[PDB]
């Protein structure tokens, strides 16, 4: 077991950061009439930890005994699609985005069977069940429009805890039905305290400067920070102040792709950059993270009266990417527009 | 006897004389019926103009009640109208005779725009081959969804929008038979908000009679929720006369007090822009901007930001109009 899973807190009182929010969530779910929840924030903030702490507070300690459940759903086109599901003796977790555009079928058939069934044991298990819809920001609009009446009819029997990164992708019919719970990212000091507590629980010594550099390099992601802390323990046991932190391959590949964009502005360089973007897309990297990393690196080499136009260009082509279906067209259009703007800026 | 029906179905023109607007088309159709030479009809136009009621009056005039089931095969979009139906029941109805009394049959195809291209292509020789025994009437709203062969086979009558001059006496008859108190401005508001559609005029009249009991301009514009012409003129005056914060405060106060929606405001402002003698570039910019705002309101957007953009589209061109001189 890695450090991200071995030292996860179990109850709401064990969380080191956002303790006031932990007390508020403790007071929220005590009576049992709490509404649907929309736990949202940046990735790696601790949203799933707080959701499982809420599930630990509501039911017994039986919410940690999980199992893999498989269900085959019939599409309107009569093509069978298998979907995986984490389930417990008290709650169930669904990721409908694994079905692709058939998530509406998952909402219409899989969720109604859970919501329309009252719980078998009423004394050990409570008066309601909890369904965890994870990554509802990747849900299509048809699935979100199929979701809303299930959250209104069987609410007093089937409760929902929706988890997402951005609430802009959630339709306001869903956003009106659920209480939004904001989980911000922990700051540098909270990540340093968590890393120091993890290293002290393992019998190690962690300097403050190395923990600070691990916190800044993770970009306020506690999962990523604990992973590079474990990797830095693995590669070199003496924790020096200037110890090299390992990096993921797709981020440095994106950095080299943007360096190749800056280095030459020609159609065959555009073809090579398109090949690099095909390599990035085939490794299941999402295209909006490709656009974000591209804007993160290409703005370092831009001059001060060019960064706003590049930012507006990136946002415009990202919106056209989310409107369309093929990522390579909008990605290569953004790259070609940046090369045209860079050539016009440098030649004048 | 009294019946529980909506007023758009309780008051239906069962005869051709009860329809109001298309007098020349209905005179030609009555001369087709009286001379026993009714051809294949293609009744097209905007909704609510009386295309279904015209062919229902024609079928009621042509055939009696004791033989209506043997002569009219009425199929609409609620029934399945595939190529199996065209090669099956429709072809067998067209190619056979009548059980009770000798005469020509009628196949009414309501919502013929919703039919597939395969069924429309299979319908051509059924129309052409058996034109002596039966006649086909196609009723559609979009003529582009009907193949040009079917448009060639059937003579077309454009049932255009109902002008408010001839639309008044039918509403007066409905008012007199429904015992409704109505003023002149109430009838003007009905024939203005209906916009060539007698169905929503009767719906507005029934909803205003249920909501208030009286039909006045205030009651109609309150039940419908439409803004009045004076308030649209005031909104245009605020957007063209004052600065951003004062015009924003005035329009937001009016929208909060009246409970207005931005779609009707955009529609009436778009109507008032073409009347106002704008320059060509200013009119082009304004039309593009209001098209962008009205497109933007079709999704889960905030209406306050779109109202600020609607003010912004005129605050941009105020300086251009003034410096044009």
């Amino acid at each position: 077991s890695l450090w991200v899973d071995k030292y996860r807190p179990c109850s709401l009182g064990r969380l080191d950061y956002h303790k006031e929010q932990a007390a508020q969530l403790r007071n929220l779910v005590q009576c049992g009439d709490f509404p649907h929840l929309l736990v949202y924030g940046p990735s790696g903030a601790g949203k799933k930890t707080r959701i499982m702490c809420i599930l630990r507070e509501l039911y017994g300690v039986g919410v940690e005994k999980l199992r893999i459940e498989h269900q085959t759903i019939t599409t309107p086109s009569k093509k069978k699609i298998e979907i995986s599901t984490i389930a417990s003796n008290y709650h169930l977790e669904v990721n409908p985005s694994d079905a692709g555009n058939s998530d509406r079928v998952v909402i219409q058939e899989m969720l109604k069977t859970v919501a329309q069934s009252q719980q078998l044991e009423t004394n050990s298990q409570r008066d309601f069940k909890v369904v965890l819809l994870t990554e509802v920001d990747k849900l299509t609009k048809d699935a979100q429009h199929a979701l809303r009446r299930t959250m209104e009819k069987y609410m007093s029997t089937c409760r929902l805890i929706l988890c997402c990164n951005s609430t802009s992708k959630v339709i306001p019919p869903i956003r009106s039905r659920c209480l939004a719970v904001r989980v911000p990212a922990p700051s540098i000091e909270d990540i340093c305290h968590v890393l120091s507590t993890v290293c002290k629980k393992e019998g190690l010594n962690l300097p403050s400067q190395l923990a600070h550099r691990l916190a800044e390099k993770s970009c306020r992601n506690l999962r990523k920070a604990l992973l590079m802390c474990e990797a830095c323990r693995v590669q070199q046991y003496p924790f020096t102040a200037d110890q090299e932190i390992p990096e993921t391959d797709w981020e440095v590949y994106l950095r080299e792709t943007a360096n190749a964009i800056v280095s030459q502005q020609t159609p065959q360089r555009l073809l090579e950059v398109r090949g690099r973007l095909y390599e990035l897309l085939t490794h299941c990297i999402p295209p909006e993270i490709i656009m974000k990393g591209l804007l993160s690196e290409l703005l370092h080499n831009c001059d001060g009266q060019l960064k706003g136009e590049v930012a507006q260009m990136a946002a415009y082509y990202e919106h056209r990417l989310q409107l369309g279906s093929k990522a390579i067209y909008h990605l290569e259009a953004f790259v070609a527009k940046f090369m045209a703007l860079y050539k016009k800026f440098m030649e004048d | 006897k009294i019946r529980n029906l909506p007023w758009v179905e309780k008051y239906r023109p069962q005869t051709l004389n009860d329809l109001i607007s298309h007098q020349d088309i209905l005179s030609t159709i009555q001369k087709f019926i009286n001379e026993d030479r009714l051809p294949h009809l293609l009744l097209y136009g905007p909704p609510g103009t009386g295309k279904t009621s015209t062919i229902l009056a024609c079928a009621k005039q042509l055939y009696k009640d004791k033989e209506f089931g043997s002569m009219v095969l009425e199929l609409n979009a609620s029934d399945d109208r595939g190529i199996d139906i065209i090669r099956g029941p429709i072809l067998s109805f067209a190619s056979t005779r009548t059980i009770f009394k000798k005469g020509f049959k009628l196949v009414i195809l309501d919502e013929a725009d919703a039919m597939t291209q395969d069924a429309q292509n299979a319908l051509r020789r059924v129309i052409e081959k058996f034109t002596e025994n039966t006649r086909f009437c196609l009723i559609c709203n979009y003529l582009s969804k009907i193949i040009p062969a079917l448009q060639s086979r059937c003579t077309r009558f454009r049932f255009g929008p109902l002008t408010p001059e001839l639309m008044v006496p039918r509403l007066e008859h409905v008012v007199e038979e429904e015992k409704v108190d109505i003023s002149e401005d109430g009838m003007k508001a009905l024939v203005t908000l209906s916009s060539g559609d007698m169905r929503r005029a009767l719906n507005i009249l029934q909803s205003t009679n249920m909501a208030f009991g009286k039909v006045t301009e205030e009651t109609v514009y309150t039940c419908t929720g439409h803004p009045l012409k004076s308030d649209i003129a005031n909104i245009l005056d605020w957007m063209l006369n004052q600065d951003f914060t004062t015009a924003y405060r005035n329009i937001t106060e009016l929208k909060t007090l009246k409970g207005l929606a931005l779609h009707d405001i955009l529609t009436e402002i778009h109507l008032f822009v073409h009347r106002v003698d704008f320059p060509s570039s200013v009119r082009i910019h304004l039309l593009t901007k209001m098209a962008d705002i009205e497109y933007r309101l079709s999704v889960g957007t905030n209406e306050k930001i779109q109202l600020s953009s609607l003010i912004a589209a005129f605050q941009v061109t105020r300086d251009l109009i003034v410096a044009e001189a």
Partner: protein
């Protein structure tokens, strides 16, 4: 007995009564006189007389052997993969005695609705039994008929009818029907027809039945002016960045009751064949498609069409 409409009562029964495409109709008349006609595909606009020419040629070639040596199939029939294998093929092998120069005629009207596999199965029965049988196909869009079928025939193509060609048959129908008329009303009938003889006969019968006299305002009371002739002038007004006249024509077409889908479709058809620059036409077509996306998703008002007109005027002033 019930009197037929003038479209089907005044169908030509001989090949000399068919007007328009004089060389093709004359060659069909020569074939009908002599015999040994080849396989024939007639393509053209609706109402030109392809079915009339095929049926007149078959009636003149066969004559009294019509009921046993002619197989007529339409889109109202099946014409699947089984009908070609068991019905066209069995009739092709079927022995019918005939005079010299005369063959069995298999008439396949509206061959666009024929599937690709059925037309593939139609090839070898067409080539093998050509000593005994012949084929006569009629179609509107010739691209739906596959290339091996078109190689097996003399693909005749019909053009849209000239106004004088419609006018001669209008004289014919008027003098057998005793219709009072004026010249301007008949020009209005021709203008409403637009190369369609079915529409000419339908509008003439409607004007004669409704009013009894053919002047211009009697025609235009029940018929309508054609829609893309105004759309051409409004697109021309959009070319010179004149938004006022373009909106005047757009509002006139809006108050006539035309749906936004029909208006934008005729806008696209006019802009397809309009005479301007190629790049300007391409960005016009892109703008038309971008507006048609908004029409298709649900928002369709006069404001969207005016915004499309303003964007088309913006495309000229933005080099």
């Amino acid at each position: 007995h019930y009197e037929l409409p003038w479209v089907e009562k005044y169908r030509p029964v001989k090949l000399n009564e068919i007007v328009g495409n004089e060389d093709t109709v004359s060659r069909l008349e020569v074939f009908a006189r002599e015999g040994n006609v080849p396989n024939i595909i007639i393509a053209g606009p609706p109402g030109t007389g392809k079915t009339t020419s095929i049926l007149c040629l078959a009636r003149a070639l066969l004559g009294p052997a019509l009921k046993d040596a002619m197989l007529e199939l339409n889109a109202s029939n099946d014409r699947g993969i089984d009908v070609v294998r068991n019905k066209i093929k069995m009739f092709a092998q079927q022995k019918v005695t005939l005079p010299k120069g005369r063959h069995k005629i298999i008439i396949l009207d509206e061959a666009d609705s024929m599937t690709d596999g059925a037309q593939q199965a139609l090839r070898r029965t067409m080539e093998i039994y050509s000593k005994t049988t012949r084929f006569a196909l009629a179609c509107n869009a010739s691209d739906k008929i596959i290339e091996p079928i078109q190689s097996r025939c003399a693909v005749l193509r019909y053009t849209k009818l000239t106004d004088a060609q419609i006018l001669t048959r209008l004289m014919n129908v008027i003098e057998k029907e005793r219709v009072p008329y004026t010249d301007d009303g008949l020009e209005a009938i021709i203008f409403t027809a637009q190369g369609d003889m079915r529409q000419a006969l339908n509008n003439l019968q409607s004007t004669f039945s409704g009013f009894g006299f053919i002047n211009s305002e009697n025609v235009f009371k029940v018929c309508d002016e054609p829609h893309p002739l105004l759309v051409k002038e409004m697109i021309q007004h959009c070319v010179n960045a004149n938004i006022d006249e373009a909106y005047k024509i757009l509002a006139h077409l809006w108050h006539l009751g035309y749906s936004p889908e029909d208006i934008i479709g005729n806008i696209f058809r006019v802009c397809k064949t309009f005479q301007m620059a190629e790049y300007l036409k391409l960005e016009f077509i892109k703008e038309i498609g971008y507006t048609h996306m908004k029409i298709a998703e649900g928002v369709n008002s006069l404001l969207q069409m005016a915004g499309l007109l303003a964007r088309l005027c913006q495309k000229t002033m933005a080099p």
